[PDB]
Design a protein around this ligand. Structure first.
Ligand SMILES: [Cu+2]
Ligand SMILES: [Cu+2]
Ligand SMILES: [Cu+2]
Ligand SMILES: [Cu+2]
Ligand SMILES: [Zn+2]
Ligand SMILES: [Zn+2]
Ligand SMILES: [Zn+2]
Ligand SMILES: [Zn+2]
Ligand SMILES: [Zn+2]
Ligand SMILES: [Zn+2]
Length: 124
């Protein structure tokens, strides 16, 4: 099939739409909607409490929380031990949150079912 991701996103959030455009430019087929019950979406997918962000994607059963770069979504897909990856919050400089030369340091955090956190990528 075409590579595809479904995105549940915060209402009135411009960065989520920009992140979707970066994914599309990376070849992802994206479907999305503004979310009515984001607590339900995140808790059903197993996104940890303080790892939430402004949108939640779902690809091949695994969650993509926040402004995860496309290349790290591909790494998520090929790690059988991981059920999701998160960039908590909204760090400036992450894809869809970019605003000039500046960047909040951030990590893409992979998560196992056992609750283990495994860093997929670090950005200065
Ligand atoms: Cu955002
Ligand atoms: Cu944002
Ligand atoms: Cu947004
Ligand atoms: Cu978002
Ligand atoms: Zn939804
Ligand atoms: Zn689009
Ligand atoms: Zn679209
Ligand atoms: Zn859309
Ligand atoms: Zn690979
Ligand atoms: Zn952008």
């Amino acid at each position: 099939e075409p590579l595809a991701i479904d995105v549940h996103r915060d209402a009135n959030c411009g960065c989520c739409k920009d992140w979707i455009k970066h994914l599309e430019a990376n070849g992802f087929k994206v479907t999305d909607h503004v979310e009515a019950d984001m607590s339900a979406v995140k808790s059903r997918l197993g996104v940890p409490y303080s790892m939430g962000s402004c949108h939640t994607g779902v690809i091949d059963g695994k969650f993509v929380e926040g402004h995860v770069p496309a290349a790290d979504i591909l790494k998520l897909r090929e790690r059988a031990d991981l059920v999701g990856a998160a960039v908590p919050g909204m760090p400036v400089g992450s894809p869809g949150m970019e605003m000039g030369d500046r960047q909040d340091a951030y990590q893409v955090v992979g998560l196992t079912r056992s609750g283990q956190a495994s860093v997929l990528a670090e950005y200065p």
